[PDB]
Design a binder for these strands. Structure first.
Lengths: 375, 375
RNA sequence: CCCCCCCCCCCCCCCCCCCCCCCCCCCCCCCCCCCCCCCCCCCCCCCCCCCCCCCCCCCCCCCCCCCCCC
């Protein structure tokens, strides 16, 4: 009564503080940023395809080029708007298509290029040159190139942005450690696409995206909001359906510990009753309700580096964290997860009880009632 | 009390996120799209009939031509409006009827053709040429062609869109695997129509529609909304009544697992009481209520590739999925369904109990009460 | 008719306060796993069948009200 009413709400107080700032910072991203408009979108897709048909393609620029497609889907105005909302000063760079004349192999030739701050009109033609090589070879092998194999396929842009989504998936750890997991999934999920494109090398493109995200961290914001806008969509090609699916696997990255909590509660893991865990409960509810209040935007807080994500940490509660992680251990869901319990005794006990849980399913008859049962 | 209040609502949080995007993407469909207006509709229907009276007809273009009829029913303005709503930039292409003069067999002839981006005025006349051949042969066989046998019949357009609807039915799996099922149904349901049209070859047209949907995936959106607008209708010919019926068989494709859930609950399958299934319940209700909240539009989420459809998956709950699928097994409704239980022990137990359920119907007397019963 | 007695009120004491006392002080970023989805089957309907039918206006008597006292 007396003392049981004394508490301090820290998790929600902190949100309230960061939510109600009366002033703002603004960052100076760099000297330029290219904001391709809707009108350029088809050409960027075409360029993406050129990379995908190129066998053993150099994927250095592919990360950056993917970002360009995504921005050309958002559109010049929408893309700037999302940059400004994030708070960065934007030197917007208009993107037009111009023809370039250059003699390759002696003979003078025409090329379709983009005016880009980020991409030399030199390294652009080099992608188209290399693509043609892998294309005439492709034409020699099958006599006639099918539409699913060409750089025209409307899927090309989105196909590249698929391994981008997979990169976002594992971006929670912040380092390149997700890479092998990214490849693995790209191989099962995307196996059909990899059959139609010799240049769909997961390792390489995944590295190129990691690269662009690490280097230009504002793009990670841009991409997240693109994916959201792409998943808002009413219908779409199976590839866009794949993209959206993969993109959404990243919702709630960094907060795995949170879901394994709901699990511990769901399976009624005994070690949740422990006195020293019960002591933490008052606050552990505070954070779960804060997660609830936050809603949808919250899932991506860890992928973008949103300071407010620190608040969802269950790390601050060692006893609870430990039994939750032990529960997940004993149910064989963790590993090769690199989280450590701060309480070995609790972790072990939770693991032990969890392991015993899968052994006996007891039928509970009071969930569904029947007025006459012979059995 | 304490811990039982802690939960995270993930299914609804995710919807909330995709519903409330502040930005949008837009796709560049291709170079052109033909948007036939109401005024051309009768001519397209006529062209459809020409294909239907042609014995052993080449159905390569029939898929695309069907889409044109549907668009000519929606009307130029309504059809563009649905494309823009889906988010695609539209190069609208006006469709006029012009006369073409060409010498076939030496003699010069007139033809009624459409100005179409998608269809050469060459391959158009070829359908009318082939139709005439099968028509004069038809005239020779029965002396005089009845109105139900000609290419004039107002049904022709809608008849073709019938196997289109059937293609939508099985589009849930995404591949051509529905094809044999599509044929089967076209044969029972449409047997009367197949009698009046030698050119109503299900396999061929079904393949042509699969073709157009796979190739131009925006058409699948257009067709879905056409069918909705066609089923909104107040009255109509028996064929339009067949179309609507078939079209609506596709409502809830991809969500069969969901209906088999409601079934498991309905038959009071015992394995729903199991501890490890009860553990999932809290969340499995979340998704069913999300389905409820979504309402009508939800049924087609899987057919169009609407990212939000991933959310209706009961896959995320292995224990529940397994007993639901086992229940459906034991009641002999699954197969040749290619879904797999993630819990063999539960699936087997549910199947076993389900098989035992059909054996004994016990009369429950407390649903209807009577103040005096001698028996 | 109503009405009819008596009758001002008040009257003491009293400022209030007065002590002690800043506060603070440790630790600690976070994160880390796996995983697209989907896949069966199925148009709907289908019987019988207009309705209605009788009787039947309503009404009818008695009667102003009031009247004392103060």
């Amino acid at each position: 009564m007396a003392l049981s009413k004394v508490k301090l709400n820290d998790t929600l107080n902190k949100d309230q503080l960061l939510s109600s700032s009366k002033y703002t910072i603004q960052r100076s991203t760099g000297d330029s940023i290219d904001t391709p408009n809707y009108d350029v979108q088809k050409h960027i897709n075409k360029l993406c395809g050129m990379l995908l048909i190129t066998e053993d393609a150099n994927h250095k620029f592919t990360g950056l080029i993917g970002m360009l497609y995504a921005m050309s889907r958002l559109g010049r105005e929408d893309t700037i708007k999302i940059l400004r909302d994030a708070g960065y000063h934007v030197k917007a760079n208009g993107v037009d298509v111009t023809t370039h004349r250059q003699d390759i192999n002696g003979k003078e030739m025409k090329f379709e290029v983009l005016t880009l701050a980020s991409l030399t009109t030199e390294i652009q033609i080099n992608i188209e040159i290399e693509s043609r090589k892998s294309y005439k070879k492709m034409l020699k092998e099958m006599g006639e190139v099918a539409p699913e194999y060409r750089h025209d396929s409307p899927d090309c842009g989105m196909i590249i942005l698929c391994i981008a989504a997979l990169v976002i998936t594992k971006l929670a750890a912040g380092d390149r450690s997700g890479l092998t997991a990214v490849i693995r999934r790209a191989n099962n999920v995307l196996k059909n696409e990899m059959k139609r494109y010799k240049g769909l090398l997961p390792k390489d493109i995944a590295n190129s995206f990691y690269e662009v995200f690490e280097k230009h961290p504002h793009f990670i914001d841009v991409f997240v909001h693109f994916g959201i806008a792409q998943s808002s969509t009413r219908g779409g090609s199976r590839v866009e359906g794949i993209f959206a699916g993969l993109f959404m696997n990243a919702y709630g990255a960094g907060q795995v510990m949170l879901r394994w909590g709901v699990l511990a509660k769901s399976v009624k893991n005994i070690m949740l009753g422990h006195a020293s865990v019960q002591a933490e409960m008052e606050q552990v509810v505070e954070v779960y309700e804060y997660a609830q209040k936050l809603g949808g935007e919250a899932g991506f807080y860890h992928i973008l580096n949103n300071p407010k994500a620190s608040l969802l940490s269950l790390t601050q509660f060692p006893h609870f964290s430990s039994v939750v992680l032990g529960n997940a251990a004993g149910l064989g869901i963790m590993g090769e997860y690199r989280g450590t319990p701060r309480n070995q005794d609790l972790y072990d006990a939770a693991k032990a009880y969890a392991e015993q849980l899968k052994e006996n399913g007891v039928i509970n008859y009071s969930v569904l009632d029947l007025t006459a049962e012979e059995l």
